[PDB]
Design a protein that fits this description.
This is part of a larger assembly, with chains A, B, C, D and E. Chain C contains five helices and five strands. Chain C has helices at 27-34, 76-84, 114-122, 136-153, 162-168, and strands at 15-21, 43-49, 66-71, 97-102, 128-130. In chain C, helix 2 (76-84) links the parallel strand 3 (66-71) and strand 4. In chain C, helix 1 packs across helix 4. Chain D is built from eight helices and 13 strands. Chain D has helices at residues 2-12, 35-41, 62-79, 152-165, 179-187, 220-230, 239-257, 290-305, and strands at 21-22, 46-51, 84-90, 104-110, 118-125, 145-149, 170-172, 199-204, 213-218, 236-237, 265-270, 274-277, 281-284. Helix content of chain E is 60%, strand content 0%. The chains are: A mainly alpha, B mainly alpha, C alpha/beta, D alpha+beta, E mainly alpha. At the A-B interface, helix 1, helix 2, helix 3, helix 4 and helix 5 of A face helix 1, helix 2 and helix 3 of B.
Chain lengths: 92, 112, 176, 306, 349
Amino acid sequence: VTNTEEELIRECEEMWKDMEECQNKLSLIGTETLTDSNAQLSLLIMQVKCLTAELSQWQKKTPETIPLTEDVLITLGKEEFQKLRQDLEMVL
Amino acid sequence: DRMTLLLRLRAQTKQQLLEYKSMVDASEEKTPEQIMQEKQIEAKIEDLENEIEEVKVAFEIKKLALDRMRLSTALKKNLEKISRQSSVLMDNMKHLLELNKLIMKSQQESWD
Amino acid sequence: MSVLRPLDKLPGLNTATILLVGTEDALLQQLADSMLKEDCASELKVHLAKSLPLPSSVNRPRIDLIVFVVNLHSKYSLQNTEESLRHVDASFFLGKVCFLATGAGRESHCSIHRHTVVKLAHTYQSPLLYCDLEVEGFRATMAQRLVRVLQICAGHVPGVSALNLLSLLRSSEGPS
Amino acid sequence: LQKRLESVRKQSSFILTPPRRKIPQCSQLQEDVDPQKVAFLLHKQWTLYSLTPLYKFSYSNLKEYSRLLNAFIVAEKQKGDFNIKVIFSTLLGMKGTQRDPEAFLVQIVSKSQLEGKVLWTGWFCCVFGDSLLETVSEDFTCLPLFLANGAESNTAIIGTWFQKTFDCYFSPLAINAFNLSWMAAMWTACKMDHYVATTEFLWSVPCSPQSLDISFAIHPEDAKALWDSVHKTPGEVTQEEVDLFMDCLYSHFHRHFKIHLSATRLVRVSTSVASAHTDGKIKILCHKYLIGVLAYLTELAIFQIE
Amino acid sequence: VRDEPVLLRFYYWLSQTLQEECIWYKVNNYEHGKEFTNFLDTIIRAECFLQEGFYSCEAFLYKSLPLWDGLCCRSQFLQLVSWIPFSSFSEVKPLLFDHLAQLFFTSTIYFKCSVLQSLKELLQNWLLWLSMDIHMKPVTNSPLETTLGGSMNSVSKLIHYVGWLSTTAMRLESNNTFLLHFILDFYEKVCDIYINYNLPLVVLFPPGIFYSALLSLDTSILNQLCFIMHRYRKNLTAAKKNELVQKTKSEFNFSSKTYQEFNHYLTSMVGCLWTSKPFGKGIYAEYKNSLNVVHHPSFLSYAVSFLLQESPEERTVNVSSIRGKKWSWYLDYLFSQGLQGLKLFIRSS
């Protein structure tokens, strides 16, 4: 349980380095305000640029092989069985 | 229980990293901007939200299928060998089968 | 400088915030006290604001949600909000700006039109909700409603993003 | 029934008031309009109510309805001699649209125990109420607006009688504080070359445990020179003309006292034309612009029904 | 009585009753709200005795759904939306379905279950009127296939909107079974449209509901999934008999996109139960036997209890050798507990 803890410390450490690399690329983009005369055009044209931006990203991501071996899924399964027992009392 | 904290902060960090990467891909990738009508723009909005809903239910059903296969093999290796948690796990399965038998009789009488 | 952006710094570890923007100080304080009654799995940090642009503070976290509590019995809450949405970014309007029009239960003493805040939300692409914060039973329904928006904008659920909240809160009249 | 369906969808949508309105014309009194009747209608205190359209109303059955009303309101005072008698008087020539039904007058005039003293005055009318006429049948008579003069206990015992005979129900009328600013801008859009009163405004502060009132007076020759600098497109009163006229009145108050009155609530507008209040109290002080105000009150009275 | 001024005067009274004597127009009295709760109990028994909603009551919900928050007699307000009569789909969605979806994804899950209990009673009374509207109209000499075809896309976009409400709110709560019982109770109303209502339209749900119910941890969700898919076979093959008669006139025809989609549902569910090939097109050392009838975790409670009732002096646990003769004894124990929908599915499909 301790070695699968420190694997999840290290996998959350390397994606913390991924987001601060994305934070340093995002700070170069400056200020962009919005007026009243062209507010319907400056929010819907960029939504076409916004919905295209994760269309490549949700298709790049595979079903992720999360490395878990033993003694986490058993303890999460008993917590799942404890909430399944309360849900079948409430639906009764 | 620290493993729920590790999985919840891992899913939160994955969601924040995915929305940061989509914000960087929105700031760095552009479209050709022309003079267009509004209804073709909202038609592209509804077609893109149908396509992004299709790939999000594809990723959700494949990730949930991998999770249920790992939980099925984890419960198979759990109930292969008799352990010390069986004395409450057998009582929990007996209470779940009695509550499910009551839900079967209630569903049959309610349907008739 | 005196600008606002939702993405400059780090949020933290299971910690979100909310920027309560309004003119009334006794009405938004009871909304701020009622959000701490409904418990959750995240640390809540309620920020109270008068009018945008804010003063240059350096101890501010990453902002996940800015609500604009306008009053339907006051034009002073509307004219400060019109000066508030000039100094904003277009990345706030991807599902991170909610509106609250208080005074909707009293249709005898109202001081601005209902179609005005619809037209303010239609050209700026923001969801519009109506609630009366003078009733303590209505305020706990409102304080439940600010938490489940803040679970989306902080990214505490898998699969639902901030622009997924904008697609669910759309408003369009029937073309027939 | 299909035009009853199309009037719901304008009320179900958020749009119900046009942003560009017409300046009201000079309503000249015709020869069919009685001059001695309209002087009695002026300088009186009125309470407004809205009403659903009536059933089996005829113009020749008023003699039977006068005897049933005189036998009932004496009896309601006995359950809790009276020399009172109601008069159903019909007025002519007030209508501008020919499809409107005829308005009439209901008084209570005391008899001569020695003209009697009028204790209560009821008035049913429909001035430019054409949007509700095609939503009713031809059996229905559409008189939405009602004005009462007198005590509220005499209103409830006669308003009981319209519930049990004509299958209707009275509701209290209320005008919003947003809609007082449009009718104040309409009263400053008038044309005058005669004796005028003072434009009186009154705001109330909602953020107090007690009441706080501000009396505010504007000279109307100073109001007319303030209006035409704002009013630049003639013939139409727009959305931006009224909201910039209220903003320069608020900025005139702001440089002296540093109190924002745009957070407050406007409750009383009294000009040279008429005086208004939010709960339905009106005092019409002009006869040349009589039906222009009363068509605007039927413009609100259909909206509280629908 | 279908007289016109007896219904317009009832419209003119009760619209003024709900407007003046409402909740938020008062000074927050609990005693007048109890009488307003007692007045709404008279309305919900009068709309059910008449079997059509009043024209005052749907006009009040046009003006109150922007003004409602989600509490303060929720159960009397969600039954007031349950008996609204049928209209067009484009008129309901700016006035009801936009203001419902602003409160559906944001309130609690007891509100999320009470919307789908209200919409399954809305799917009762709308399909009850459309089942007998064909019978009581011999007047129009024109064919009614444009009017039934105009009523076809009004109700198929109804179920695909609530099916879009069901597969999005599953992602919000992240697979709770308490919402999943009342999604499949809403499709119990869908799957009885040709047998009980005689309406020639077969609509299907997107498969985010399907693999969340197939891979659920509950036996009763798997019984109701095998109940609806048994009803989907008897609705579609009887519509194949409707396609075979109406081929010579080319009037009542179905598209070929619902036959290839239904083949994707039937092949993928027998690969997770019977064929032992769980990887298909939607889903892409015992990975071929991780998902079976006896290897599913909801039926694993019956798999442990089968080996205890055979011999309660056990030493090893062997759940993978249940084949042949004691596999029929394992199906005899599952059929006796009340799995009647799985018994009718295995004898037909």
